[PDB]
């Protein structure tokens, strides 16, 4: 796994930024949606705003991005998703600073939902 290449002028060195959250485990993963729970950064250095939770298919390099999470809660549930296809989910804290250490990407595979399988 090796993907980004990215960065910006003038950025903190992950110094007063919010550690990475827990290993992100699919607690309860469908065939349409896949909820996910984690722990909360100990060290956020501000206030946290949202949970930013990304999302792709296999083989594809892009990806969405689903911000929106409850007043006091980690978990958030991803819908819109497609069966019998591996997912790639993820989970990054954004603060008053900005986006801190990424979590580790994991890979879910959609519960088999009417699969064309013939028997």
Same mark, same amino acid.
């Given at each position: *796994?090796?993907? *980004?290449?990215?960065?910006?002028?003038?950025?903190?060195?992950?110094?007063?930024?919010?550690?990475?959250?827990?290993?992100?485990? @699919?607690?309860?993963?469908?065939?349409r $949606?896949?909820?996910?729970? %984690?722990?909360?950064?100990?060290?956020? +250095? *501000?206030?946290? =705003? !949202?949970? !930013?939770? $990304? $999302?792709?298919?296999?083989?594809?390099?892009?990806?969405?991005?689903?911000?929106? !999470? #409850? @007043?006091?809660?980690? #978990?958030?549930?991803?819908?819109?998703? +497609?069966?019998?296809?591996?997912?790639? $989910?993820?989970?990054?804290?954004?603060?008053? %600073?900005?986006?801190?250490?990424?979590? #580790?990407?994991? +890979?879910?595979? !959609? =519960?088999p939902?009417?699969?064309?399988?013939? *028997?």
């Amino acid at each position: *796994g090796s993907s *980004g290449s990215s960065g910006k002028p003038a950025i903190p060195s992950s110094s007063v930024l919010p550690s990475a959250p827990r290993d992100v485990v @699919p607690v309860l993963v469908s065939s349409r $949606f896949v909820r996910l729970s %984690w722990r909360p950064p100990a060290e956020a +250095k *501000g206030n946290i =705003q !949202t949970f !930013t939770v $990304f $999302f792709s298919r296999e083989g594809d390099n892009r990806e969405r991005a689903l911000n929106t !999470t #409850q @007043p006091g809660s980690l #978990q958030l549930t991803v819908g819109n998703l +497609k069966p019998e296809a591996m997912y790639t $989910f993820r989970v990054v804290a954004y603060n008053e %600073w900005g986006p801190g250490e990424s979590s #580790q990407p994991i +890979k879910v595979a !959609t =519960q088999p939902e009417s699969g064309p399988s013939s *028997g």
